[PDB]
Amino acid sequence: EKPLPLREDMW
Amino acid sequence: MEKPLPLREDMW
Amino acid sequence: DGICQSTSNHLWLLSDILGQGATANVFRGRHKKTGDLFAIKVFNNISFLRPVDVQMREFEVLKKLNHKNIVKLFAIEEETTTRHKVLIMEFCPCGSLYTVLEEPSNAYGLPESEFLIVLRDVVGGMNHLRENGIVHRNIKPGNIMRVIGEDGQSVYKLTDFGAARELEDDEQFVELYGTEEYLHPDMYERAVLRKDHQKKYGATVDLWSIGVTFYHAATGSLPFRPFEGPRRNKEVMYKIITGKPSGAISGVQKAENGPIDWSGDMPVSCSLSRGLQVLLTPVLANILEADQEKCWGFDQFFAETSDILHRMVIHVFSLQQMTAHKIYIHSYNTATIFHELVYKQTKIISSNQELIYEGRRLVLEPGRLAQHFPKTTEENPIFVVSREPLDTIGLIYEKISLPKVHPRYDLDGDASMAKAITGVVCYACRIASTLLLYQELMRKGIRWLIELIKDDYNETVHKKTEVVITLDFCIRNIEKTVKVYEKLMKINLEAAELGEISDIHTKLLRLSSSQGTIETSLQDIDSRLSPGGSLADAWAHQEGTHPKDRNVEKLQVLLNCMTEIYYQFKKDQAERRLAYNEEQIHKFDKQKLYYHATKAMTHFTDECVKKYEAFLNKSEEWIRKMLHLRKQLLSLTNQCFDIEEEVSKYQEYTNEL
Amino acid sequence: PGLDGICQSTSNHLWLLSDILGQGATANVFRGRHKKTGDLFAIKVFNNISFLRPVDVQMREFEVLKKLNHKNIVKLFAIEEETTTRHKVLIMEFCPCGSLYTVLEEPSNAYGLPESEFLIVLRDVVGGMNHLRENGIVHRNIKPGNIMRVIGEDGQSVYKLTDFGAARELEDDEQFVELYGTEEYLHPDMYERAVLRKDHQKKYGATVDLWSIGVTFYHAATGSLPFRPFEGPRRNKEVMYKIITGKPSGAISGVQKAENGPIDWSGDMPVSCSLSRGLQVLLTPVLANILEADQEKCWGFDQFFAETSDILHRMVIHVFSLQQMTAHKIYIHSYNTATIFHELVYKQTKIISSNQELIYEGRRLVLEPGRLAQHFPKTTEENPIFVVSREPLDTIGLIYEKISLPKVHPRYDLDGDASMAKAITGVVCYACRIASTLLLYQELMRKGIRWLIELIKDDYNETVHKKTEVVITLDFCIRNIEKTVKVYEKLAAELGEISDIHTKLLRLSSSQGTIETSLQDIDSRLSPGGSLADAWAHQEGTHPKDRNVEKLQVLLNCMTEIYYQFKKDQAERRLAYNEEQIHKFDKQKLYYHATKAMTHFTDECVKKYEAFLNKSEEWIRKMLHLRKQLLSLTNQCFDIEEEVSKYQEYTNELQE
Ligand SMILES: O=C(NCCCNc1nc(Nc2cccc(NC(=O)N3CCCC3)c2)ncc1I)c1cccs1
Ligand SMILES: O=C(NCCCNc1nc(Nc2cccc(NC(=O)N3CCCC3)c2)ncc1I)c1cccs1
């Protein structure tokens, strides 16, 4: 468990 | 064919 | 350049660009919430200068396509900032077919194993296209994606439908898209030269796109080559793409403005088996047809290709010729059909073919199906031998030498040279690998054949000594009577004629020296069949290369070094400038490339080729030695049925008082 | 010269400080190039603590190593000075393929190294060690991270020793006092004086290397260290010492399975080991004597060398026991006769040489008792020599270790995830290894049963070829010879000769009739439809067309690549935000692939193998029973041909 989703501004 | 020259420490 | 774009559910980095086109770019993106990667196709700012009628052409085409061999269009979302429609489709990491054909390993053709996979997937997808009514007129190796199946076997898929249209089976367009080398002539004419005349095309262009692709994947070369490269000479390229005579699959120009060499055959450099080339070249010569009259239809093409894909392979090795063969045969064919296939490839008739397999003969009845044959591989094939003489052919490769290294320090000029100079050594490695198998299969079959002449010799002794006893006591059955024919009576001073049983004694005894001379004749056979005889394979373990020599492994080690330089020089030719030390290393490693290529090409012709030819000569003299001995052993074998059928009718007269 | 932070140089070589190969307390090693040529070398520069071990006694060591030239020693070309620092620098031959440690860190070798490569390691390590002893240099520091690996001209790897960091010049017998090495591969004497700051008057010999060589060999043979104190051996500094000191004679491995509990002492290889049973019985005793703690029962080098030389000088003949479904590698000498070959088959399969029947490439194999093993038929593993007896044998199959996946820890841990991906990928590697072995065993059983059935047809045809010879004599040389001239006395003449022999003629002739009755039954049982049929063989078990091992390899490559990424993800102690979530997603992807592979391994490869194993076992019964029955008929034929061989000897009297 506990996976966070990706984000745009962090790339 | 003899274009290669010795490597030099100042280009690195 | 860490800029990025995103939709509602996917995001990608502009630097992570997979492919590129004039109409759109293709990026490696990920699903924001799952992490799984997809290929994202965003359309550039210039694709919105096309009419809205035409900027939907690829959208409705990829909609009605869901099939393996077609790159799965997963979804279609809108980008965040620009609101541009983008295509989320499956990501094939292994690159395109062109990515594969650029490997120096496949510089002279794909391995025959992979070619049948490319054949299978291209037809399956192209069929699904015409089945759903789409003519994608830009079929090229850079367009055919490769993805690894669940079983390691490659699975190829189609994409880049930017050149598509809603085509009906008898409709034709008047528009223009594609890439040069793999496009139909009557589309090359209008697209390259902007010259249009007297023809429109639909559902026939793709057959040409496929056929040119297949020839490239088979020979490692494009089928229609004008001199000075295919970059210019488009007037010459069109002179070849249209003036080509029907039934010739390749048109190459040797000289500058010289002749146009036509050929209906595969080059010797091709990797595919001869059993396949005879099935393949008809398909190429009939879809490489400009006009619609002498051309094949989709109906005839898909039927003929499926006939190849629905066959099985039986590996047969000619021992008298030292030639391997692949027999492409349906599973529902019979054994007498199998013999016909072998005759067409070895020119030895059906009545002459003895089948040796795993140290045994092979019971070959005509009423047996192909799928019930013994399972064969190339290393464990069905051997075939003939009692009549055959020319020892051997392997027929193409003698290829290294190209000339150029002294001009050129970034892309060395990269183009590194590709070819590695490909030449790559071909020699594949040949030396086959030469090894040809020698090792020789040793395997000869040993099995020698064991079969011993079964032929031991079988007669079990019969001859079985009639030597039928005649041993048949001659005393009337000798114990002729002994008393005159023991109780008249004096038996000498042998004279006595009755009907006096000629059945003086002529039957003649079968004791006429047969006694056979028992001594078999000894000369058993002597030459013995370890010390004139038929021993003492030379087989003495001549030619051996697998323990590791010649192929030595070549491969040199090739790895050549390949590492080539893969490096392509990184170098990207961004065509080098620092000082980097430039010198490139110049140094350029010379090491020639050193490894020379060492390899020397070891090939001096160790593998020389000893293979030495082995092919010490085996040419043994073929005659064996075929002559079989002629003598059979003549002695037939005498034991002429001696034993004679002691059969006279056996009745000797059972009396 | 360079810009002080990016590169150093000598008069003849130069190197980037970023192309760093290895670090050490005395020196560092870089990937450099000869100035005038561009060719690559490994450059070792002694910065600090080069003055810790004396300079002259270490410099004289370098000049004598500069003359050293051997296959298994990393060549020391020249010894120079750095341009500005004037530190001493050694130019050495560069080994791009890394060390043996890098090879043992692969998941493919998480258990035994492949037997082929292990023999290479054993050959080279012994070869290099012998070269040092013959030149009087003590290593005292050999470990996997120390044995370099290069690829020879023939593609076979060549291992080369280096980093003689604990080295000086030694005779055959004298005294020492030093401390250098890494903890795991250390002799028990040095483990106290280098780990637990405690000294004693205990002495050494040529043996301090022999222990390190022993631990190194066991590691390459099994993928694990031979002495593990419950947790990692690097943490239990005390319990690790208690194990090697009280190591019982003969034991080669001690593992504490429960905390502060007993230590399980084993004297043979683990089942997980990849090496053949034929080699294990040869390697185990070598490992035993060199892993002896005290110098009283240790081996010494002269014995250790000649012993491993025997293992290396042997060749291998491949043999597959058809009734036991077991493959075997036979380590025999080239000069060894054919008789001793049967001995080695006995010790492994419990088949005495009297009932050792050999099939090879479709036919029986005749064994001249004096034929040399260097002229036996060449045998691959897929082309072995099959051995069968007419005596019953337990059908064993392959004995592998049932290794299930570790529990994947859910916490996000850069170190834990990387160390866990290593083990779980290694488990799928061991599973894929076995999956390939199972398919080979099944395909060899098919190749053997097909040959043996064709062989019994030869034995059948041999006896029916004999029956047609005694009946052509019994019915003709006796029934006709006697009926005409002997049963017509009406007076030697009419004695027990006419009564007993005429009856025995009809005794043998009538009983021979029912011999044909039992002969056609045997022909029917090994005809297409009979009880002895290849049918089940082509039906049960996995097949090459199934492509189970390829399917497992596809999954394994995704796991392998995820592990290699987690290795680099561990290089940073902290991951960027989006990278953290990819690592979190790929961690679940890593465990998904593993369970998917283990499912297909157990449900597909294992099951159909074990199903094939049973239908094999039941066929051995019906096979061995038919051969015993055909034999009984074969001996009746010779018996009848013997009884008639003397009745005809009196039919040739002919005096009446
Ligand atoms: O012509 C075109 N695209 C050629 C292929 C790009 N298309 C796709 N690629 C992948 N994955 C992938 C991964 C690694 C390498 C590659 N291939 C290349 O790098 N190549 C191939 C030809 C020369 C350079 C592809 N997934 C989906 C697609 I859609 C196009 C022009 C406009 C759209 S597409
Ligand atoms: O640590 C040390 N020596 C171990 C090797 C370094 N020395 C040499 N290396 C190479 N070629 C090479 C190529 C690729 C990688 C590597 N390195 C590894 O694979 N490593 C590093 C430690 C364990 C895993 C080496 N040639 C010659 C030598 I001399 C030393 C510390 C102080 C002296 S030596």
Give dist(CA C486, CA D625) in Å, integer. 58
Mutation to probe ligand 1, out of C92, C94, C143, C156 (largest number of atoms < 8 A from CB): C92
> Which two three-digit tokens encode residue C334?
């019979």
Of C427, C395, C226, C242, whose CA–CA distance to C323 is shortest? C395
Of D343, D213, D327, whose CA–CA distance to D274 is shortest? D327
Task: Specify whether the CB–CB gap between C498 and C482 falls below 8 A.
Answer: yes
Mutation to probe ligand 1, out of C38, C160, C213, C216 (largest number of atoms < 8 A from CB): C160
Beta bridge partner(s), residue C53: none
Q: What is the nearest CA distance from B2 to chain D, expressed in angstroms?
A: 12
Which residue of chain D is at minimal alpha-carbon distance from C11? Answer: D578
- Is the minimum distance from the CB of D94 to ligand 2 under 6 angstroms? yes
Give dist(CA D184, CA D234) in Å, integer. 8
Give dist(CA D135, CA D140) in Å, integer. 15
Give dist(CA C280, CA C312) in Å, integer. 15
Contact C409 B11 (CB under 8 A): no
Beta bridge partner(s), residue D120: none
Q: How far lies D53's CA from each of C19, D50, D56, D313, in Å?
A: 59, 6, 9, 41
Which residue of chain B is at minimal alpha-carbon distance from D40? Answer: B7
Give dist(CA D189, CA C188) in Å, integer. 83
In 3-state terms, what secondary structure has residue D332? strand
- Is the minimum distance from the CB of D73 to ligand 2 under 6 angstroms? no
Q: How far lies C333's CA from each of C280, C308, C357, D329, in Å?
A: 20, 14, 20, 42
Which regions of D35-110 does DSSP assign to beta strands (E)?
Answer: 40-45, 76-81, 88-92
Q: What is the CA radius of gyration of chain C?
A: 35
- Is the minimum distance from the CB of C19 to ligand 1 under 6 angstroms? yes
Residue with tokens 């002529």: C507
Q: What letter does residue D358 receive in the DSSP assignment?
A: E
Give dist(CA C344, CA C349) in Å, integer. 9
Phi, psi for D209 (deg, rounded to 5): -70, -35
Q: How far lies D556's CA from each of D14, D591, D597, in Å?
A: 41, 11, 8
Residues, chain B: 12
Question: What are the structural domains of chain C?
Answer: 4-91 (3.30.200.20), 92-309 (1.10.510.10), 310-389 (3.10.20.90), 409-657 (1.20.1270.420)
In 3-state terms, what secondary structure has residue D445? helix
Give dist(CA D330, CA D315) in Å, integer. 8
Give dist(CA A6, CA D584) in Å, integer. 11
Residues of D in contact with B10 (CB under 8 A): 1-2
Give dist(CA D20, CA D42) in Å, integer. 9
Considering only CB atoms, D38 lies closest to which of C553, C557, C588, namely: C588
Contact B9 D33 (CB under 8 A): no
| Neighbouring residues of C510: CB distance < 8 A, sequence distance ≥ 6 | none
- Is the minimum distance from the CB of D29 to ligand 2 under 6 angstroms? yes
Q: Crossing angle for the helix pair C551-573 and C411-477, nearest 10 degrees? A: 160
Q: What letter does residue C159 receive in the DSSP assignment?
A: -
Q: Measuring from atom 34 of ligand 1, which residue has the nearest CA?
A: C160
- The 10 Å Cβ neighbour count of residue C357 is 20
> Which two three-digit tokens encode residue C578?
């080098």
Contact D576 A2 (CB under 8 A): no
- Is the minimum distance from the CB of D74 to ligand 2 under 6 angstroms? yes
- Is the minimum distance from the CB of D44 to ligand 2 under 6 angstroms? yes
Q: Where are the alpha helices (DSSP H) in C102-171?
A: 112-132
| Neighbouring residues of D206: CB distance < 8 A, sequence distance ≥ 6 | D133, D172, D300, D301
- Is the minimum distance from the CB of D162 to ligand 2 under 6 angstroms? yes
- The 10 Å Cβ neighbour count of residue C358 is 18
Phi, psi for D321 (deg, rounded to 5): -80, 110
Q: What letter does residue D169 receive in the DSSP assignment?
A: B
Give dist(CA C440, CA C444) in Å, integer. 6
- Is the minimum distance from the CB of D240 to ligand 2 under 6 angstroms? no
Relative to the alpha carbon of D91, which ligand is closest? Answer: 2
Give dist(CA C230, CA C224) in Å, integer. 9
Of A7, D418, D246, whose CA–CA distance to C33 is shortest? A7
Relative to the alpha carbon of C41, which ligand is closest? Answer: 1
Give dist(CA D297, CA D284) in Å, integer. 16
Q: How far lies D485's CA from each of C485, C487, D176, in Å?
A: 13, 15, 103
Contact A6 C80 (CB under 8 A): no
Q: How far does CA C460 lie from the centroid of its chain?
A: 42
Task: Specify whether the CB–CB gap between C18 and C66 falls below 8 A.
Answer: no
Q: What is the CA radius of gyration of chain B?
A: 9
* CA C256 to ligand 1 centroid distance, Å: 35
What do you get for the CA distance between the two ends of chain C, in Å?
118
Give dist(CA C343, CA D598) in Å, integer. 49
| Residue C333: half-sphere exposure toward Cβ, Cα within 13 Å | 20
Considering only CB atoms, C469 lies closest to which of D33, D152, D472, namely: D472
- The 10 Å Cβ neighbour count of residue C440 is 17
Give dist(CA D298, CA D560) in Å, integer. 41
| Neighbouring residues of C297: CB distance < 8 A, sequence distance ≥ 6 | none
Task: Specify whether the CB–CB gap between D126 and D308 falls below 8 A.
Answer: yes
Beta bridge partner(s), residue D388: D357
Q: How far lies D523's CA from each of C372, D457, D466, D532, D616, in Å?
A: 22, 8, 15, 10, 21
Mutation to probe ligand 2, out of D15, D91, D148, D157 (largest number of atoms < 8 A from CB): D148
Task: Specify whether the CB–CB gap between D395 and D620 falls below 8 A.
Answer: yes
Between CA D253 and CA D257, with CA D256 as vertex, the angle to 5 degrees is 115
Q: Measuring from atom 14 of ligand 2, which residue has the nearest CA?
A: D98
- Is the minimum distance from the CB of D47 to ligand 2 under 6 angstroms? no
In 3-state terms, what secondary structure has residue D388? strand
Beta bridge partner(s), residue C86: C42, C77
- Burial classification of residue D655, based on how many CB atoms lie within 10 Å of its CB (0-12 exposed, 13-18 middle, 19 or more buried): exposed
Q: Measuring from atom 5 of ligand 1, which residue has the nearest CA?
A: C19
Give dist(CA C5, CA C28) in Å, integer. 11
Give dist(CA D225, CA D255) in Å, integer. 9
Q: What is the 3-state secondary structure (H, E, C) of D564-633?
A: HHHHHHHHCCCCCHHHHHHHHHHHHHHHHHHHHHHHHHHHHHHHHHHHHHHHHHHHHHHHHHHHHHHHHH
Pairing of strands D363-364, D357-360: antiparallel
- The 10 Å Cβ neighbour count of residue C290 is 18
Of D593, D603, D610, D609, whose CA–CA distance to D552 is shortest? D593
Contact C153 D473 (CB under 8 A): no
Task: Specify whether the CB–CB gap between C22 and C38 falls below 8 A.
Answer: no
- The 10 Å Cβ neighbour count of residue C295 is 17
> Which two three-digit tokens encode residue C320?
């008298």
Q: How far lies D441's CA from each of C27, C306, C366, D399, D599, in Å?
A: 47, 36, 33, 12, 21
Q: How far lies C221's CA from each of C108, C212, C213, C250, C364, in Å?
A: 7, 10, 10, 10, 42
Q: What is the nearest CA distance from C555 to chain D, expressed in angstroms?
A: 8
- Is the minimum distance from the CB of C47 to ligand 1 under 6 angstroms? no
Beta bridge partner(s), residue D9: D14
Residues of B in contact with C417 (CB under 8 A): none
Contact B9 D9 (CB under 8 A): yes
> Which two three-digit tokens encode residue D409?
């820890």
Pairing of strands D88-92, D148-151: unpaired
Contact B8 C407 (CB under 8 A): no
> Which two three-digit tokens encode residue D584?
């979190």
> Which two three-digit tokens encode residue C300?
């005839």
Pairing of strands C382-385, C354-357: antiparallel
Which residue of chain B is at minimal alpha-carbon distance from C578? Answer: B11
Q: What letter does residue C605 receive in the DSSP assignment?
A: I
Q: How far lies C34's CA from each of A9, A10, C147, D165, D408, in Å?
A: 18, 16, 21, 51, 19
Which residue of chain D is at minimal alpha-carbon distance from C465? Answer: D469
Resolution as reported, in Å? 3.4
Beta bridge partner(s), residue D329: D318
Task: Specify whether the CB–CB gap between D224 and D113 falls below 8 A.
Answer: no
Mutation to probe ligand 1, out of C86, C96, C137, C145 (largest number of atoms < 8 A from CB): C96
DSSP H or E stretch at residue C286: helix C274-287
Task: Specify whether the CB–CB gap between C181 and C225 falls below 8 A.
Answer: no
Considering only CB atoms, B3 lies closest to which of C409, C579, C580, namely: C409
In 3-state terms, what secondary structure has residue D262? coil
Task: Specify whether the CB–CB gap between C103 and C567 falls below 8 A.
Answer: no
Task: Specify whether the CB–CB gap between D306 and D291 falls below 8 A.
Answer: no
Contact D155 C584 (CB under 8 A): no
Residues, chain D: 656
In 3-state terms, what secondary structure has residue C252? strand
Of D494, D411, D24, D365, whose CA–CA distance to C447 is shortest? D365
* CA D68 to ligand 2 centroid distance, Å: 19
Give dist(CA C406, CA C262) in Å, integer. 30
Considering only CB atoms, A6 lies closest to which of D412, D581, D588, namely: D581
Residues of A in contact with D581 (CB under 8 A): 3-6
Q: Give the position, in ligand 2's atom list, of the atom nearest the Cα of D94.
A: 26
Q: Do chains C and A touch (3 or more CB pairs under 8 A)?
A: yes
Task: Specify whether the CB–CB gap between C438 and C324 falls below 8 A.
Answer: yes
Task: Specify whether the CB–CB gap between C637 and C525 falls below 8 A.
Answer: no
Long-range contacts of C451-457 (CB under 8 A, 24+ apart): C451/C359, C451/D362, C451/D363, C452/C356, C452/C361, C453/C529, C453/C626, C453/C629, C453/C630, C453/C633, C454/C529, C456/C630, C456/C633, C456/C634, C456/C637, C457/C522, C457/C525, C457/C526, C457/C529, C457/C633
Which regions of D288-443 does DSSP assign to beta strands (E)?
Answer: 314-321, 326-333, 357-360, 363-364, 385-388
| Neighbouring residues of C517: CB distance < 8 A, sequence distance ≥ 6 | none
Q: Mutating which of C411, C585, C587, C598 best tests the B interface, going by the most B Cβ atoms within 10 A?
A: C587
Q: What is the CA radius of gyration of chain D?
A: 35
Q: What is the CA radius of gyration of chain A?
A: 9
Between CA C381 and CA C384, with CA C382 as vertex, the angle to 5 degrees is 130
> What does the buried/exposed string (b/e) look like for C603-633 if buried means 16 or more CB atoms within 10 Å of the residue's CB?
bbeebbbebbeebbeebeebbeebbebbeeb
DSSP H or E stretch at residue C78: strand C73-78
Phi, psi for D200 (deg, rounded to 5): -155, 170
In 3-state terms, what secondary structure has residue D550? helix
Residues, chain C: 657
Of D408, D244, D394, D236, whose CA–CA distance to D321 is shortest? D394
- The 10 Å Cβ neighbour count of residue D578 is 22
Beta bridge partner(s), residue D78: D91
Task: Specify whether the CB–CB gap between D141 and D213 falls below 8 A.
Answer: no
Give dist(CA D254, CA D242) in Å, integer. 10
Contact C584 B4 (CB under 8 A): yes
Residues of C in contact with B3 (CB under 8 A): 407, 409, 587
Task: Specify whether the CB–CB gap between D153 and C557 falls below 8 A.
Answer: yes
